[PDB]
Amino acid sequence: NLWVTVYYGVPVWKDAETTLFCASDAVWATHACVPTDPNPQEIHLENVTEEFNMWKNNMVEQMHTDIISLWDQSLKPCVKLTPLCVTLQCTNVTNNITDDMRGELKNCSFNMTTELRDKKQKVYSLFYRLDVVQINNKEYRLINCNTSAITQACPKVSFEPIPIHYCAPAGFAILKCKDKKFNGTGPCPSVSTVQCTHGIKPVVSTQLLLNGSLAEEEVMIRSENITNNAKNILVQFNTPVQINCTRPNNNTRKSIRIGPGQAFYATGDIIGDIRQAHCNVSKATWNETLGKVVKQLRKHFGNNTIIRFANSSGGDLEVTTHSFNCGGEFFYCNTSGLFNSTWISNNDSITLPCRIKQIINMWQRIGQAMYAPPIQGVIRCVSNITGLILTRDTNSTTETFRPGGGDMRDNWRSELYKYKVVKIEPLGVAPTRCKRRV
């Protein structure tokens, strides 16, 4: 007869959420974080299979709110720009006649309170017409002042995305499938496990995904519900698509001592190649990759349907255009130049017009706003487009797709789908032929 035998160290686990913590090397917000191991360990697990589900992966939720928390903490100790909310006296800026630049900035002046709380000083600064609005030269207002206060980001702190690793506490395991195929959820024939995750950069962007990871095999299409056009579609590329964006303005920073003590960085003068900031895209590369994407689409909609690509529905600029950070500066680009195509039934280069804003609102959050300091000198950078955030638009053939975003949990999820966290249960029992003596 068999008896109850007690076992400990049993290799079993249940899907469970706990509090994850970071790790990264030894700028943005990361210093108070445990350095990574010089030899991150892993182990493929043979005969071990189980389901993943990226759409209920609470790792995303934590990461999201943690990044937000970091953001706020990095701003509290910086200078508040409360006394900037004043009536502005502004005029057009006579760019090289006649007018290709459309101005876009105003030579605003105003009676400003200085360190000598008492006698004020008439000063001036160049502002983008996206930041200011006419009251009622003419009178203008900082747009934020009708919604909330605004804080100047410190000139020392940066916004450069840094690779972050996530680790689980003892008793919890980081599981990672290596299956090159994945529908977004279901069993994985090839499952491994790791100490911690790979370095993920906290890149904030809409519409286009930047500097992410690459997919293997073919282009990956992932969606909570492909047939439901109330949902959206994640597209992961196989090959990095280069994009090179430039701001050809060697401008200065007429910092103004609007104390007491604390200093404000206003916009000095704009000189150099007065052209609109824009992005350069390899056209043939875009066409080629887009095609590869359409192949996938064909595979989930039929071998006799029509695929069209267009821009967004419009509205809030933050959603309408492609937003991203380069070197502290915030760009808004008209991606109509990319998302304008079509496919049937079965250099060259592209220039994307961009705009610059200085007053921005993070993560759709209202109640506060952050002032970007102007960055001195010409700003230009390059990155890898590694995926798309697409939405699905008389429904028997032609379908139209367009870029979206808004919810930045989407961005974190586009990477964390490779991971899941489980809770180990060391204690188990089993029937064994054994009668225990004294």
Binding site: N1, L2, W3, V4, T5, V6, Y7, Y8, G9, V10, P11, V12, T18, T19, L20, F21, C22, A29, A32, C33, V34, Q41, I43, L45, E46, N47, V48, D66, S69, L70, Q73, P77, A168, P169, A170, G171, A173, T193, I424, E425, P426, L427, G428, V429, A430, P431, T432, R433, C434, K435, R436, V438
Partner: protein, 132 residues
Amino acid sequence: VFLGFLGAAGSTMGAASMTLTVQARNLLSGIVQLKLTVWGIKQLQARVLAVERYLRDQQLLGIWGCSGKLICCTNVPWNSSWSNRNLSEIWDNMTWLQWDKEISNYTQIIYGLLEESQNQQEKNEQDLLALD
């Protein structure tokens, strides 16, 4: 042969029992190594939860007179209603995950007798053997 953490997870329960310690070590792990700040109380909380997580079950093994754990026998007989399979149908043809899939239904029920029967009776008895 050293396999690695959970290296035997994809094997039969008999096979897996070979290397329970390789797992045991990292069940508590250890090491790890402007105030507050994000992570400031998260590494705190997590590292705490690890300790509790561990001891909560370790104490049960303390109560279930074994202590010298990973494996030990009892004087509680197995009730046939708790998944009636043969040893070769169990130990030589089933993983631990597959095992739990079934037996998990009677977890607290089995714990009842483990928490008690023997622990109660093994003692008293001894106290009586100490009479002389």
